[PDB]
Design a protein around this ligand. Sequence first.
Ligand SMILES: Nc1cccc(S(=O)(=O)N2CCN(S(=O)(=O)c3ccc(O)c(O)c3)CC2)c1
Ligand SMILES: Nc1cccc(S(=O)(=O)N2CCN(S(=O)(=O)c3ccc(O)c(O)c3)CC2)c1
Ligand SMILES: O=P(O)(O)OC[C@H]1O[C@](O)(COP(=O)(O)O)[C@@H](O)[C@@H]1O
Ligand SMILES: O=P(O)(O)OC[C@H]1O[C@](O)(COP(=O)(O)O)[C@@H](O)[C@@H]1O
Ligand SMILES: O=P(O)(O)OC[C@H]1O[C@](O)(COP(=O)(O)O)[C@@H](O)[C@@H]1O
Ligand SMILES: O=P(O)(O)OC[C@H]1O[C@](O)(COP(=O)(O)O)[C@@H](O)[C@@H]1O
Ligand SMILES: O=C([O-])C(=O)[O-]
Ligand SMILES: O=C([O-])C(=O)[O-]
Ligand SMILES: O=C([O-])C(=O)[O-]
Ligand SMILES: O=C([O-])C(=O)[O-]
Ligand SMILES: [K+]
Ligand SMILES: [K+]
Ligand SMILES: [K+]
Ligand SMILES: [K+]
Ligand SMILES: [Mg+2]
Ligand SMILES: [Mg+2]
Ligand SMILES: [Mg+2]
Ligand SMILES: [Mg+2]
Lengths: 425, 425, 436, 422
Amino acid sequence: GTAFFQQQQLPAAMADTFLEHLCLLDIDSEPVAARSTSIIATIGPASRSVERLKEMIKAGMNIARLNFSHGSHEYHAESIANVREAVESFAGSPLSYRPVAIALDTKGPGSGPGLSEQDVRDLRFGVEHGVDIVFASFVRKASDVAAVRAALGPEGHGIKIISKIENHEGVKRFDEILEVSDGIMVARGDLGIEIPAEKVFLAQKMMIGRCNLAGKPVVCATQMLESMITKPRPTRAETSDVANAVLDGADCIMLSGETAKGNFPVEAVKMQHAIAREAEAAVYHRQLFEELRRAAPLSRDPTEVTAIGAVEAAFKCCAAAIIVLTTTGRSAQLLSRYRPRAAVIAVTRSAQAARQVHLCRGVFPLLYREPPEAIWADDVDRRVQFGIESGKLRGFLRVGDLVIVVTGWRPGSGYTNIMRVLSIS
Amino acid sequence: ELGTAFFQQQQLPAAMADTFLEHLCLLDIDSEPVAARSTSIIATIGPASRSVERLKEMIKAGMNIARLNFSHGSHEYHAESIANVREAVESFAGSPLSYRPVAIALDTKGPGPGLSEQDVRDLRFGVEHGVDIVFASFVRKASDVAAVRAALGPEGHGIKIISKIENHEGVKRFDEILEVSDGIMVARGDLGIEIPAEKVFLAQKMMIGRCNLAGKPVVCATQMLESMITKPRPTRAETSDVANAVLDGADCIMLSGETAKGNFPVEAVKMQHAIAREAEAAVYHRQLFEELRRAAPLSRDPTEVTAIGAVEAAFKCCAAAIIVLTTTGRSAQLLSRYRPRAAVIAVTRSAQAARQVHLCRGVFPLLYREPPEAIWADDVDRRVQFGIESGKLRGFLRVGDLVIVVTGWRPGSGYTNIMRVLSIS
Amino acid sequence: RADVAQLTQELGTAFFQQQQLPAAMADTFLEHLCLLDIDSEPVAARSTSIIATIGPASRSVERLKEMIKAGMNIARLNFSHGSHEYHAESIANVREAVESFAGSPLSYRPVAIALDTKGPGSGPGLSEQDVRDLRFGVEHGVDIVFASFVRKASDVAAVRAALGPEGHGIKIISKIENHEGVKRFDEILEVSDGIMVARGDLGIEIPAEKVFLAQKMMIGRCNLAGKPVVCATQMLESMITKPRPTRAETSDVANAVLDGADCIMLSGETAKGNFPVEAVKMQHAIAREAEAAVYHRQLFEELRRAAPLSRDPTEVTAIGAVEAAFKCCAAAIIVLTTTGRSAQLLSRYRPRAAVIAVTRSAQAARQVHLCRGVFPLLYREPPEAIWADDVDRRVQFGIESGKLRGFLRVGDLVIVVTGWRPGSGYTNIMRVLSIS
Amino acid sequence: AFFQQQQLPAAMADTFLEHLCLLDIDSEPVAARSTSIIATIGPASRSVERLKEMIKAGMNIARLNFSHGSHEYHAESIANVREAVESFAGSPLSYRPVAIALDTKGPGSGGLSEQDVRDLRFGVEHGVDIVFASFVRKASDVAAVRAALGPEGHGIKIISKIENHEGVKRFDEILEVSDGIMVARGDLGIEIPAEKVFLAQKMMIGRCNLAGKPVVCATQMLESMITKPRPTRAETSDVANAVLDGADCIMLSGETAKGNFPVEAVKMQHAIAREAEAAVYHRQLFEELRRAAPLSRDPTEVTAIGAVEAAFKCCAAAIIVLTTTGRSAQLLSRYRPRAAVIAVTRSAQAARQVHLCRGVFPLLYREPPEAIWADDVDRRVQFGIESGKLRGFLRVGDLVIVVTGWRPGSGYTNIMRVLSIS
Ligand SMILES: Nc1cccc(S(=O)(=O)N2CCN(S(=O)(=O)c3ccc(O)c(O)c3)CC2)c1
Ligand SMILES: Nc1cccc(S(=O)(=O)N2CCN(S(=O)(=O)c3ccc(O)c(O)c3)CC2)c1
Ligand SMILES: O=P(O)(O)OC[C@H]1O[C@](O)(COP(=O)(O)O)[C@@H](O)[C@@H]1O
Ligand SMILES: O=P(O)(O)OC[C@H]1O[C@](O)(COP(=O)(O)O)[C@@H](O)[C@@H]1O
Ligand SMILES: O=P(O)(O)OC[C@H]1O[C@](O)(COP(=O)(O)O)[C@@H](O)[C@@H]1O
Ligand SMILES: O=P(O)(O)OC[C@H]1O[C@](O)(COP(=O)(O)O)[C@@H](O)[C@@H]1O
Ligand SMILES: O=C([O-])C(=O)[O-]
Ligand SMILES: O=C([O-])C(=O)[O-]
Ligand SMILES: O=C([O-])C(=O)[O-]
Ligand SMILES: O=C([O-])C(=O)[O-]
Ligand SMILES: [K+]
Ligand SMILES: [K+]
Ligand SMILES: [K+]
Ligand SMILES: [K+]
Ligand SMILES: [Mg+2]
Ligand SMILES: [Mg+2]
Ligand SMILES: [Mg+2]
Ligand SMILES: [Mg+2]
């Protein structure tokens, strides 16, 4: 229908030049797709109650950040328990349950050259409490990342390390840090003090571009909606900043004081949710996909080959979603790197993977709880149907839609290799 | 992984270029073609190419389609030509490495205002003798194609009608003719007499472009290697002409007098084979695929969606082949329209489809005659393995290579919706 | 690499490391982003104009001199507050501070004066206070009118009529502040000289999360039309009370320049804030960094592909001159202009080279600050007897001011744009000159 | 009506595929033929009357094949060409200069042969404009030809013929020291496999286009026309494709030297080239030539790109350039403008040699001088406009781009002007 092609900036998406795309942007063209940029909310006195945390999950919070620069281990263990209680209060309805990752943001090296002794104790605390992500403060070289990985020990092998770039050395040694990290955080607060304030935007755009090229998650952080710490509505520069972080290519956007100590934590999450949906519909996929395809190297990895074929197929039919079965989240990450307009519904049995895939833009994790079927092909079909039923319940899919299904040839991680065009019934 | 030697062959340095101008500058006479020749050769059968022994030599040289010119000779003469082609083709049935299906095409005498009485009798002869293709002479409007289609009686609706554009009216009414035809022949002999000779190249390039856009086969015909009727080597203009027809986008190239009455019929086939291989490696796939992708409309047909995803996947891993299961040839045709560098190995139970897919560039048919398995998924696996073992036998594949496999979710034609990445073992 | 090798050997590797030149030579926008470098210093003069609102914090002649030195190009008088006597005193103080630098003509900086109207309020069209304020503007010689709440083409025609016969030279920049203005944008732009994205009211009239779409759409359409566009309101809001802006504020300024804005504005930050000079300095610093990060390779290609064919010699000469400037990395394009139009047509193609506009019109010299990358030089000398000699003297005045301000160095290439006969509308010549 | 002619619907297309789909056999070519025709002089094209007919059919360069005939035979051929060319000098606004090219015999079994030294000396003594140097294998072969031309032959253009594997492999070093290249497909098709010649032709044409140096496509282009009045479908396609590849010149060998239809062969190449030039996809071609050409601080180079860009912006009928050596016209030609490059020169040799560059129409200025330099310059621009109007290039109301310099003498072009006709 004509109405379908007037929504989600589709006239602007069909434009032949970026200039014509801008000219065709319409304030009356409503966003239809689900919000794909994840929201990281910092936990503190304003967002610690179980009842307030339930409201933040409903507003769109995907990752809860624990800032280990403040508070004791007892304080952070209580934060973890309240987050998990609020998250599990919706587990009674598996088709609508939303996993929420828990990220530990370290205190940092301070005046020291490498990993501090408090960071070693805090990292061990994180492993013992089952955190999913580490936001490693003041990463200056590859050996800083290796020190964090060593401090996590053998039990913390599955924890993602997102390196925070906060100074000139981190910006200069970016390539070596990105190579050994799982992703990056553009920590603009310290970065704006370490380098001239008027240069932070160049560092943010460079790091986002390089992370997008590498297919690794990138978080834009600090002062995005600062004025909402005390005021009910943000400034015109703040809404523009959030929108531009999404247009730059950020996988995640973050709230610090807005959710930890401010007076509008739920509204700050709602505002980031609303801006991100508008900005995602304004993305010029025509040039973006072409450039991501052209820049990505040739590959002999079947997961990598299936991912590009599935994204290409999704664009060809305007697929409502790409449903992917994943154990570690990697198959969903490789689909996410090509920035499909189709939502990536990732069905997994790993609760940790379901929490961690929020780091990748456009990945909507579904945690499958059923015990395995005796026949593997039937267990695979049951999970795909769970993805279709959750998608229908949440508004991602309707009868008549086309979906791309990405599965593998045997159980276990690393064997994705099948792309299937499916009609929703 | 593949080596520097691999990336120096088949014009791969020229294929990686960022502009068409840089692609031209990087073409190398020392870069040898590795892929199998994908542009089919149509050879006209006449006194110089009628004997079973001569036909066996032409099959070995590369003839894929045998053309019977009904402008000369009786029905008895053409029935003997058909029998000799079939005898020469079946003389290699014992060896899997040498067996190659050969299509039989009937070229009509022509019109008078519409379908002539002799054309009705000749078309009826074609149906009775099981011809695969009709090259319909002097098509000027859509109603001429409908007359040929109606003349293919009740038993011949499976025969492909390739409309010959030979005059100004056919060129002007091209869109309506292509819409109702299976493909087109740029019949340059009469076209060069009906329109100014210096305008034939414009008509050829326009029709080839429109056929490529429509995803329908296009044949370049007449005087391609004319001097080879009496001389053992062609002129510099003739080799250039064959190469440029392949670079323009022609699915097939044809020999008329060169093979029907000339002194070097086998040598003419060998020459077309050698030039086509060189020209196919020089194709600028980078821009070609992007433009075929951008110009092809969005589709909700799973075969069309699977085909683009499979071609995209083949380019990503430099796949040795795309193995497709097809009953009518349609799934292989939709892969062929995106001009993959990988060979399209079409496994079919239909002898007619195996002969007719020679009309589509890069489709290498395999006729499969094993009795069907009781379990459909096992029958599918057996045909995919048949394609891999014939591929290994003929030099298309080695252990360690990657292939793309295109199949459907249920038996019967029209259900292609699956693309798999397979490692050859 | 071969397309820059001889020029890299000539100008040096250090030249090609500054002003984001490695990022500018990238083949894709993605590679351009990856190559942005915080250590690549901006070299070019700041091309995006700064509009500063005059108020109690920025009214004194001494404070205004500091703001001119910090980079203020246009002084905005907000007629929503203050009396005619108050605004006349503000105008006089701006003119006094501007003329305090007139002793040195090769370095003098013109400053435009803009009148921002109160608006229609609850009314349907032009209010009676707006008619009195517009007459005040004509009587006091203002250069620009920022017309509040423009909702249709007839609103800008009413403003033009209220300016009368004597205000024909005044530029009307229409402020888009509501849903109707956004929806009727094309008809408003057609009859206006330019647009202001008035984000304050716009963010109240439409959902706050949609303002960025309206800003980007209007900037794109103004760039396509070749007409000036101003980005306004809350750009450095926190600097009203703090000496340093937030990370969202610096990002906002940078993104307005990257979107394609000709001008950026300061409101309460300069009118009533505690750091008016610091706010101007911050906008200056961010705009220079953002201008160097513009992806000229795709931008120029798209401006050419989108611009229709033209049989106007000024339009034809402008694209030829911008193309020539990119070919040699020209330090500047010196253009002779009477009304500012020839400089505006060069500016629409977004050259990296500075557009040094030599004019005898003091009003045109002030008004060309609306066009990005135009550096006005007011020529005060009496005419030569031979017209060709008068033209040459004006070109040499541009080269000498260019050398004395740092725009040009001996060995640089410059593009000179002139006409074949005196008077406006005859630009048709482009010359390549080597600086000696 | 203007936008339906010269394949303008196909020229406006956003992709090459859409450009192909929009090619129209009913869209007539309007612009003058840009690709020069080199015709080989022999028994079938030696008479003054036959040569006059070939000049009217479109011959721009006369090739003397020194592989056959004596010096006396070639001197008579030169004299007949000059007599036929000067028979049209009575009308200066329509006079067509014709270059004379000497094609050497070659090294044979040997570097530079002793017969080649004598033939090159003959060429200098007889005032030839171009040398087509046979079997060039390395840069030192070009230097040997340059030395054999001596001090009296400094102005002669050396076009290196690439005829073997070594010439193809050492192409870059040969092009660097040559004025241009000839893709000599006859010997090349014997030295390398016949099925690889098209790759060598396309590579050399692309590299010459990138370098901004002339490239000639040669041998068997219309071969069958040696005995038949019409060419084959492969032959017309070959000529069209050489123009579409980017060749500056196309050549006729036996077709004009010994064939039964020399005038018809020239007419056929003229007709095909005009059709192929209108089918050129300028949208991508200009963008790629522009992107591939390096940045430059040479004012002639900078003015040339500004002028071609300006010509495309207004659909200029022509770019009128004042040139001494032909260089300013060559730098305009390298960007492949759709506008004709009308080169007004006083140098008769430069007027003949600029036929090597596609789209350059030389006008030999033989009008009285003006005392004031600026008036003399203006008069040459008016000469270009009047010849353009007379020959059909221009009409009243058209826009032209005029390219001149700031002071006399070669190497000072730095001005581009937009001018309205009449
Ligand atoms: N992250 C990302 C990666 C790839 C492509 C894109 S993109 O497609 O959004 N991309 C916007 C930036 N441009 S631009 O050339 O700078 C530009 C800017 C303003 C204009 O009006 C214009 O004509 C061109 C290139 C297209 C985004
Ligand atoms: N869709 C499609 C179909 C067929 C071939 C191709 S193609 O990719 O082979 N290709 C042809 C040639 N054109 S061109 O712009 O005419 C051209 C010609 C000569 C040049 O030196 C040049 O720089 C450009 C470009 C595209 C693409
Ligand atoms: O993204 P990952 O971690 O590589 O997981 C993909 C894996 O998931 C599957 O689709 C299903 O496997 P399981 O039955 O073990 O969940 C495998 O075929 C495939 O290898
Ligand atoms: O190309 P076609 O004629 O549509 O045939 C493709 C068909 O082949 C298959 O892959 C296998 O089908 P069969 O087992 O019936 O041969 C089908 O699933 C698919 O629909
Ligand atoms: O940009 P504008 O207003 O068209 O003015 C450009 C004009 O300036 C000139 O270069 C010089 O004109 P004047 O001598 O009137 O100042 C004219 O040739 C040209 O028409
Ligand atoms: O193309 P060339 O060889 O550089 O000659 C171009 C020259 O022609 C002119 O326009 C006119 O020069 P002349 O007066 O010497 O004929 C020069 O100003 C310019 O340098
Ligand atoms: O640590 C952070 O998030 C910062 O410095 O912005
Ligand atoms: O019949 C043909 O092939 C022709 O006329 O070219
Ligand atoms: O009036 C204004 O400037 C606004 O609303 O932004
Ligand atoms: O000399 C030539 O031109 C050839 O050999 O083709
Ligand atoms: K911290
Ligand atoms: K026939
Ligand atoms: K106001
Ligand atoms: K010779
Ligand atoms: Mg920090
Ligand atoms: Mg025929
Ligand atoms: Mg307002
Ligand atoms: Mg030879």
